[PDB]
Amino acid sequence: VDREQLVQKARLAEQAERYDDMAAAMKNVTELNEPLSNEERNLLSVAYKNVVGARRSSWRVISSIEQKTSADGNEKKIEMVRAYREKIEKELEAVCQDVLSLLDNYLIKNCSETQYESKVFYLKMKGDYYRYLAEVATGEKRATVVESSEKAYSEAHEISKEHMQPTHPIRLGLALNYSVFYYEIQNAPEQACHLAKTAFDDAIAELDTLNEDSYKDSTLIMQLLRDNLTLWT
Amino acid sequence: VDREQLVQKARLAEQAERYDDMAAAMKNVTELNEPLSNEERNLLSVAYKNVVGARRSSWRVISSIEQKTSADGNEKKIEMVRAYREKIEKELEAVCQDVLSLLDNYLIKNCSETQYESKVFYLKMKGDYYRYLAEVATGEKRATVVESSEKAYSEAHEISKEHMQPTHPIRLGLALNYSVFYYEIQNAPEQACHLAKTAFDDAIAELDTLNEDSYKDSTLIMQLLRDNLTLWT
């Protein structure tokens, strides 16, 4: 019931791979209104990434069955498939809204004007989980969560482009997901390519900035930025 | 609500890797009191094995940590681990009692005295989930489920030894889990290895007689019998 134990339960849940328990424990420590340490901050991101990832993976395979079996299949089986897809859809959207609530009410809110690292970390997460919502949305409900993802990504970009080094893994990771957001959600290959290229180039010019602690995390993201750039011609 | 839809729901949940949903669909198909076909029998077996299997891996990870923490005596971190262990423990035992009820009320009940193949399959399954109970039980509650696992395994063994060919994958796999029960649960290594080699020897004496269909299935379980022998000193 104590905060120090709640973080320990989340550590245990990750070892037991019960990410629903892990995300619930971190949801509690976030609700205590005390700021999150760098480690506790990564426990929350890992927990809800696994939870929303399980729903998103299940949603993708069911929706694929729903589309490829939407021509000839019996009217009774397709009514069972689309019913299962929407059940997963509501589960995904409920987890996303759960994350965006912690972000707007506790995490982004309790950030000072000088906490550019945590501000960019939480703002990128906001654009991430709004992007996950845009994958399963259609019509006017899609165009709004798309612009909410854009407002979260764009603000995280300006704070990162000014107050953080180009080799910082948080700044690099943001440019990755932001450029992915442009290519897959907005269908803007020209802008997605530009965003990923400048972030890679600016990190290359200051390659002599990597320390022994942050050399791994930064270099792999640069490779992923290259990998995504080769794919987009 | 229809049986053909319930089984198709279970196939969806398997592809979506939502084994909790899959076990619930096959529980409904079983609760219609109509005997289960071969395909529906394995859909139920696969679903609950994944459901109870995720709890077995989580319990083993947590109970391993509980052992290294009960020697330090932190008196505060140890109690939170035992709580998480017993939370997973109750989830595991609830899944087992759910399967054992389906076995006693529907599956074994609807087996005629001449349905030797199905009688061995379900009885072995009964000894299996009673053994899963024995892995997390203590005191006299353990010696109870150990005795229940023994009666189910032994009766399935006598039926298979009399009415089944030694190369039959059902009979071979029973000897595997029965020998595993002897070594790991009852700590009777003389009989665990006697059982494993007897079943392996008897199955080779007529291994020439089979088709290729009953060759890959038959031999794979035999390799497991060999692996267990080498790994059991």
Binding site: E14, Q15, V46, E184 | -
Partner: peptide, 19 residues
């Protein structure tokens, strides 16, 4: 390469029978 976004797998330390 299917999901082109950023993975951060872990933040800690992440049969004998037939199956």
């Amino acid at each position: 390469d299917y999901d082109l976004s950023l993975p951060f797998p872990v933040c800690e330390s992440c049969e004998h029978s037939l199956d």
